[PDB]
Design a protein around this ligand. Sequence first.
Ligand SMILES: *P(=O)(O)OC[C@H]1O[C@@H](n2cnc3c(N)ncnc32)[C@H](O)[C@@H]1O
Ligand SMILES: *P(=O)(O)OC[C@H]1O[C@@H](n2cnc3c(N)ncnc32)[C@H](O)[C@@H]1O
Ligand SMILES: *P(=O)(O)OC[C@H]1O[C@@H](n2cnc3c(N)ncnc32)[C@H](O)[C@@H]1O
Ligand SMILES: *P(=O)(O)OC[C@H]1O[C@@H](n2cnc3c(N)ncnc32)[C@H](O)[C@@H]1O
Ligand SMILES: [Mg+2]
Ligand SMILES: [Mg+2]
Lengths: 131, 131, 134, 130
Amino acid sequence: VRWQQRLNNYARALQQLSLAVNLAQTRPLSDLEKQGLIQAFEFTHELAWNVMKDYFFFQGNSAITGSRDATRESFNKGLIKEGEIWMEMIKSRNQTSHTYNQSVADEIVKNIINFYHTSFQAFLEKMQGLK
Amino acid sequence: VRWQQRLNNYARALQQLSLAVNLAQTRPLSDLEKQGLIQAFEFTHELAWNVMKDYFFFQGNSAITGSRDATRESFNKGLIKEGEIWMEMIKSRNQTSHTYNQSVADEIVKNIINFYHTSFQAFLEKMQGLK
Amino acid sequence: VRWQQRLNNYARALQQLSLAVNLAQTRPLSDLEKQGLIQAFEFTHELAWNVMKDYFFFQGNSAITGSRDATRESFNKGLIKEGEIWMEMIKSRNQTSHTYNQSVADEIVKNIINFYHTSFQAFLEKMQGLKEHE
Amino acid sequence: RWQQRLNNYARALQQLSLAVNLAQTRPLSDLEKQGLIQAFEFTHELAWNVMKDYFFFQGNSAITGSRDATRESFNKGLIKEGEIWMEMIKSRNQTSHTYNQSVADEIVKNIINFYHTSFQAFLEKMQGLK
Ligand SMILES: *P(=O)(O)OC[C@H]1O[C@@H](n2cnc3c(N)ncnc32)[C@H](O)[C@@H]1O
Ligand SMILES: *P(=O)(O)OC[C@H]1O[C@@H](n2cnc3c(N)ncnc32)[C@H](O)[C@@H]1O
Ligand SMILES: *P(=O)(O)OC[C@H]1O[C@@H](n2cnc3c(N)ncnc32)[C@H](O)[C@@H]1O
Ligand SMILES: *P(=O)(O)OC[C@H]1O[C@@H](n2cnc3c(N)ncnc32)[C@H](O)[C@@H]1O
Ligand SMILES: [Mg+2]
Ligand SMILES: [Mg+2]
């Protein structure tokens, strides 16, 4: 029940992230649109690890508390394949207060486009199949 | 001095937020640009309350635990005038994981444009006068 | 065999749970003893579904992500008979943080004594048999 | 609201306190030792959720789980004994193994000798904060 509602909101959020990633593949993003892509990454990643946590609670695991726990357990049980990429997302979340520096904003944007988006899509497909 | 270094970065972040606020006064923002305005609010507010915390720490106050404490102390010591607006900023910060919903995003955007931008400008002028 | 080694630990855990259940059939438990019965249910259920997961992995099924997956597969394959009871166990596990409320503690304790203990014992017998025959 | 979470924390801690007091007066049975561990687990779960709720009230919505909450509470002075609060998380992670008498005895020892006092200090600190 609760995990499937979270999954639906995750899909909605990721759809907005995907639109921004597809726009970035068409033309360069403005500095303001880059900040918007980073915000879409923040709300998509937040939903994603909460889908993990909710799913494991549905499975009867109430030991997961945070995003690192949820990510580790997802890798251990095969919900994700790229454990290191998902751990890197947590590091990127911890940098978003520094994106008023163009170099930080560019580096997060590159990781979102080059790695995080496809990982989000794979996780969505995996959880939809479990649902 | 740390709080003055923090203030210089606050000024750079506020300059970026102001570009986006001034753009929003002249035409509708796209959905992605709205999220970027929210991200610029996030990094500008995070710098602003850390200026407050650093400044009061430099004056010998070590009891500030977070942005609400910093805001309360700034109101009591005259660093801000619009106490309720700065408290509303904290409520906005705590909603940013929900900005994939249009109702939420448009509410934060409206507050940034109508109230927070000028409150940030007033704080910049106050702190520069202390520097 | 890994699932058989897990089974031995499950049997040891269940022996401790049974001591407490049989004490609870004899006199009322104190509030603290009720918390202990809940903790023994938690370590016994944890072993039980890991026996399930281990067994199904040995059989060729590696798609089990946690106790609900394990319980569904055990019910489908006949390792357990009372599917609703084992699913209620998962709801009780997920109530663990709330047992400082006396009504929650009393509810889980009632379920452990009236339903879960029997199911744990039947599963032990079933898996012991699978060491020797199908 | 963090203050309602704090009220529940105080209620849970009162139960743990009565169990620790009991253990100071006589040996606990094996079943009572498992109960003491369970009461530690629901008290610790409330404690780090107080920490998370409090920092959310302060405007920090980045804290996710118990390690984050404990680290931020230490950094901001809500707790002083960071090592003990980090040991509590280690003990929580051992919960499935307390049917081994040596595991249970070790957690019980830490609850009585260290965790109870730290829980009390944290209650006092948070009460002072509102
Ligand atoms: P925030 O505290 O995230 O950033 C402050 C640090 O970034 C350095 N920095 C980067 N880019 C600049 C420019 N253009 N001007 C001044 N400082 C900059 C600061 O030196 C801090 O280390
Ligand atoms: P996130 O977990 O913040 O959102 C989940 C809940 O948001 C509500 N919701 C769904 N669809 C919308 C739209 N279009 N606008 C505003 N809010 C929405 C539902 O209650 C979700 O469960
Ligand atoms: P304590 O466990 O009372 O913490 C208060 C919050 O937990 C929720 N709550 C109490 N009891 C339960 C059960 N049995 N299941 C799920 N959630 C529970 C309250 O609603 C408070 O939010
Ligand atoms: P039971 O859960 O004891 O399973 C038997 C095996 O689990 C390992 N084990 C026992 N106790 C612990 C703790 N405290 N932490 C991690 N692993 C544990 C041993 O390998 C047992 O033989
Ligand atoms: Mg953001
Ligand atoms: Mg327990």
